[PDB]
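Dear support,

We are seeing what looks like truncated structure output for some complexes. This example has five components. We would appreciate it if you could run it in full and send us the complete token output so we can diff it against ours.
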Amino acid sequence: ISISTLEGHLSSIMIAIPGLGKDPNDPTADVEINPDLKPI
Amino acid sequence: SRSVIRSIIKSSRLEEDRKRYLMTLLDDIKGANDLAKFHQMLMKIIMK
Amino acid sequence: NQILYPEVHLDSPIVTNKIVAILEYARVPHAYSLEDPTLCQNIKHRLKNGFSNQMIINNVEVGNVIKSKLRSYPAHSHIPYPNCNQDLFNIEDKESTRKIRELLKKGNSLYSKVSDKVFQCLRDTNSRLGLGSELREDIKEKVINLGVYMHSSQWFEPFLFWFTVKTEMRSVIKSQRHTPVFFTGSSVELLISRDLVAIISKESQHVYYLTFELVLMYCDVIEGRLMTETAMTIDARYTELLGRVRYMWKLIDGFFPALGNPTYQIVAMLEPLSLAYLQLRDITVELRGAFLNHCFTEIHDVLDQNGFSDEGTYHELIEALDYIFITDDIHLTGEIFSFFRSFGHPRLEAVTAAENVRKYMNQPKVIVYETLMKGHAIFCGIIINGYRDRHGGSWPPLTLPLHAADTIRNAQASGDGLTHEQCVDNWKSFAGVKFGCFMPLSLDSDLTMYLKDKALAALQREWDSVYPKEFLRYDPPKGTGSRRLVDVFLNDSSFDPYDVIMYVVSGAYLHDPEFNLSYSLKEKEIKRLFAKMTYKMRACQVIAENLISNGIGKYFKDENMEAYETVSAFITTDLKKYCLNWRYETISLFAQRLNEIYGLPSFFQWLHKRLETSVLYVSDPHCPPDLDAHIPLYKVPNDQIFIKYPMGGIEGYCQKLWTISTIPYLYLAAYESGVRIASLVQGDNQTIAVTKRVPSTWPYNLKKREAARVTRDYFVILRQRLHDIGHHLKANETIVSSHFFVYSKGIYYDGLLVSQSLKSIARCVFWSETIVDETRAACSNIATTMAKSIERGYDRYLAYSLNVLKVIQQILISLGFTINSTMTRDVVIPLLTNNDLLIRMALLPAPIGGMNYLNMSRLFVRNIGDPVTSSIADLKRMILASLMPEETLHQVMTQQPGDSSFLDWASDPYSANLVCVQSITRLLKNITARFVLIHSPNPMLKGLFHDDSKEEDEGLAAFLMDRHIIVPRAAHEILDHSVTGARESIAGMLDTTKGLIRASMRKGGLTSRVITRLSNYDYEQFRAGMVLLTGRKRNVLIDKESCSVQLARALRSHMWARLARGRPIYGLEVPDVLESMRGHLIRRHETCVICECGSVNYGWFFVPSGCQLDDIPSRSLRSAVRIATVYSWAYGDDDSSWNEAWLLARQRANVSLEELRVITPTSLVRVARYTTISNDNLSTNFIYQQGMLLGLGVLETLFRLEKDTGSSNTVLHLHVETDHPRIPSSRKLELRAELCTNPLIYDNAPLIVEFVTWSTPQLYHILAKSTALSMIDLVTKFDDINSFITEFLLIEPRLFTIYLGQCAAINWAFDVHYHRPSGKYQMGELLSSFLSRMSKGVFKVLVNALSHPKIYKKFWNLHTTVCNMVYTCYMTYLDLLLNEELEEFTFLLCESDEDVVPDRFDNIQAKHLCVLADLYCQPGTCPPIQGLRPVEKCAVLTDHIKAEAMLSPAGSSWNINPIIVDHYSCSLTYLRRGSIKQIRLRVD
Amino acid sequence: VSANHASQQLDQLKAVHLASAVRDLERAMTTLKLWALGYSVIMFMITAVKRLRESKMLTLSWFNQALMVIAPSQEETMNLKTAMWILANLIPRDMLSLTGDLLPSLWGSGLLML
Amino acid sequence: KAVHLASAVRDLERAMTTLKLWESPGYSVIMFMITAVKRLRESKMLTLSWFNQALMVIAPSQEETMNLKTAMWILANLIPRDMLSLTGDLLPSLWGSGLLML
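Here is the complete output from our reference environment:
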């Protein structure tokens, strides 16, 4: 539980502050993509 | 601060002779702490 | 372009560099000093190179004329624009201003001819309401001598000068090798050119050079001052306000020469200072002089930095401000807000605004983590509670992390909502939450958001193309970009709205070469910049704000025995500098949560990511960049107009997202301070209401002190929390108050609305903002502004008289002082030589053919019934007051009708077919918008607009309206919700402005015949008015003081006679407000109207004494349902008409016939808070509602000048003075070959007896029905007779004899129809024969009823007596039925089975049709009813009576309407005994 | 202003406030009711209120007539007597002089046990 | 049917307030009823614990206990029996109670 809190804090810091992803392929882009969009 | 206190005296609903006398005393007050004592005294009259 | 005119009013900022550029091309010396000297270099560089063009010439000649005149005056000095203001506020010349002086003297002559009759008309309409003793004597002299009061003003002689100079300059701009020569005057010498105006005063030798914008500004300011000084001088309430505003004008105009442009900071301080001097009146605590200290320190800083600083000057300025702003009346404190713009507008430079934005957008910040995460937790809680409330107890899709508390997990499992305390105390539990996608993206549903026209910046490679070659040293690159958003949007060959989102999601927006963001100066500001960017990023911004506004923002929209009440205080904050303070780190987490909700990766943080890598510049055409050669934007240094690398937000563009992010911090401060907070958001103003409960036994002063103390604590907490995220609340600027807050209508002071009455009077100016100078739009603007001043508190009669004088002056200006060259001598000389013609044109109302747009009913109520009926009633009042002759009425009835189709009738239902009353600009906008939308190759507008759309619209309007009864108002409701209404709505939102009109002129959408027709409508409307009021035709039937509705029906039948051809018109006539109501005041005295007239229809108003007045599914599916219900109600309900309604509702939504059948169903606050209303004496809901509004207006007018309601209660009595089942179809519906399935228009998814409560007349009627029905039915069937004796004792006789006649006729209708007699007497003879066939035992019950002596006495060989009684009741029933006196008619039906109710209804309707056919038709012509179905015999009898009514002249007065049969699932005994028990248990 | 004029205007103002209270009470009780013809404790109630809406006063003779019309059912007579006791409790004692004669008599009477 | 209840609570509160402003005569008759209707306005449920607690607060004054019992009996008799449990738990039990003598 204490490790999970530490992971939750560092997740919020690294994605609110730009350039600190450590290459996760755009950490703000972890959302599922199907809002009836389908342009492709 | 003197202008604001004088505006409080002018905008109040006090008697005109009392307003003139309080403006005379406000012109008599020079020190900073004496202005603060005058302001607490002035706020007492308006609440009364 | 032969139809556009130069602009009448100011619509652009004032730039120093434009004036300096004109004076440096003209080579005239000047005293201006620029902060950026680059325009004082580049021009010289161009003049070193020999550069010249068409525009550098014709300033050299003007400069030579100026130097030739300045050789005459030796000691000449040029004065800059601010330093000369009072001189240009007080300037006059007798010789220069002769023509407008003669015109306005003629206007005073005409108004002096009609002023006394105007006063008599207003005195009569005040006397009918009952305020004759309360009308002041001074009002008469102010009405009669109003022109003398307007000519006595100080601003009149400036106004004639500036109106002259504006009109002569506008003529030059339209006309443009003559050289402008100086005009020698009495005191000034004047040169007017296209770009420069030179004024040399002879006595002082002060020389002024002005441009066009300064002339427009001075004309607007001086005309507004003239109108507001006239309005304050006329009305007696604004006297001390008049003195304080005059002293304010004199003091600030004295301050203008010494300071100049820094004076506008002191002018801007008037908006804080009124609220500071209002805060001095707070009863609470030491916050009386809180904001005034900041204001006084700011004014001291303004005087100190400019060098005009001494001890004597500052004290005198404070004494002057104390004289202006200290007053005792609450409602006159907000009138100073209207005089904010009355001093002018400052001059602007781009470098100052660039430095101002550069200081804020480059500031480092340090932001905590805990407050940010607590605000994010509250943000998540608000989204969760919104989704849980709308979806009924369900959590939105999310996953909590492993470290979440058990309270949040068990609330997620059990579906229990979270309070704010749980969100703040468990902010660590929301550290790694991930939302799910639950918000759909419907961009194909909405197209309106792109059609709003917005400006576009140039491409980044050609950013210098906005600057001219003239003001730059190097030649700028040419510009291939497009200026407007809608031109790129409509001409785009392939446009998918999801590709716009993909332009951000894919990441190509960061690396594009064409992106650029620019700034431009704001137009009218006393102190901003608005931004412009390219097409794709504009569309991304619009889509982003619409997506936030549709789905998520709607979520954000809103022991103790002694008992408690709630007391509140207010905090008002400014939000303008917040947008610069937003950074990526603050907005990032909220943007991630919105990305997770909407399912778009990295979408909502686009703004900061693009602005951090871009270079911004402030673009003014006259201000040049300081570059020797062309360079790209990133090489350009971070000086002058350039802001190199901004971290922040440009104003607007993300306002919804920032507001949604801002509210959680307010709620966090609410939780920490233990208060209740309600937030109201305005433009750059936020009002926070702090609420704490207090004991009710406490006095009022202690409650307010407690509320202000806890508001103080909340303010300290909120300041700390906003500083920790970095928004810098700045406590001195924010106002903390106990009573007042600022909103849109005015200042709110403890339930009082302080209103700004004199703003709209200052906005009452000659002409209106139109591309063609129209008289009618100007008169409509005058009427609208004066009416708005009436609702904000100005006197009604004085506003009406000001409207009359301003209309006369506007007509005289439009005929005599104009730039229009189509004003030939055929109409100008006849109108100017014939004075009475011009006054009769000015006074006559506009719905009947005049040029006056304010009705006398409109002065009291906002909504009037019918403009034609109200206009005819107003004309009758003016005829009775001898203001206009009687013959004018006949001319109104003999007016030549215009040519308009059925579609123009359906678009404007109250139109009276006048000749050329449509405005030029609106019709030109409609043609231009329709042309560009029909030639738009955008794939979204595929089937919405067709080239043959107008023929389809005309066919639909003809199918709706060419019926045997013509209703305009129902067809407007059908056509508004149809495809035609959708096309007109989409065409209406497109504001094409001047640019697309010029573009369509180049394309040729407006043909030359259209241009020559639209150029001459003002001449033709003056010609039409002259032909109307000159002509002489009279009718015998029309009489003076006949009914207004009768005259309106006659007028509508005359002027629509070509289309209607004699058919009736229904649904347009509502009686006038003023001619229907007669009111009277009472204290202990008899109302006279009640004493003699016996008028018991009145409304009742009460005012207590001794009260202080002054002191304390889809849209397309809804449209289809609306079309179906209006078509079913208006034109009948059967199987044939429902197919047509299904076809009209099928075009908007995908429904079947069965599915469609299932799915289809102010300033009164001074008095009106204390008044008590009762309408129990009132017996058409619009008339009663407008009567209530009129009574409130009466009570407002009675107590306008009275401080207190004194020593007696007031009572006001406001009296009121008092046919088709179905319409078939003639035309066949054209329809369309295929149905367009666009989401804008088409939607494919179907998706979704208590006797006590009855009133006493109803108890009489139901008892009289039950006694009569039971009696006659028993006679047909031939303790209950003793019950009948008691009931006949208890009933009223007249209702009984009517209902007895009804039941007798219904039960003998079949035998009468078999014998077929004609007329009343023969049917009565046959019914008397039927009563003769009855025996004595058949009528024995009524014999026993007549045996009682009291029944016999009330109702006046008893069997023959009963036969004579039934015959007499039958004769009376027939006599009421012939002249339609059966207004309350009901045949009650007692039913046991619900299925046989249509059968009984058909049988009794057949009986009624037999009665009508035997009364009306000839004997033997009726078809037999024997051996026929009831609905078949009803149909054949209805057809026979309709055919016989068409054949005979009689029959129209006869009613073919069937009887009304109220049904009840009760016996006769139950209803009858219940009525007896209630009429004995109730009062009687 | 003399005391007599102020007393007259005060009586008029009390009459207006009593009429407004009667109208609001009638609306409330009709809303409660709408969601043989032997009436009950609220069906009795509004009838008296309806007499107060049509400006005719409650009188001992009206109570005797109402007892004689409801006489065979003793439970219903108990219901109407309790309903007039409810109206005695609702109206303040100053305005019972304005209502009539029944409610000053019924203000003295009280329930023995809850 | 909650919309029908709530609206009548608003109209009763308006009627009792306008009666209370004109009265020549502790929360007594009608004043306690205004308190109870205000508790109904705040969506508070009538519970046995609240009435027992109110009995403990107003215990020294016996006449005021009689006043509050009579006012709760007013509110018990005026409200119909279908909505009576939606008011709270006090009012059916007070509907069970009755007077011995007028």
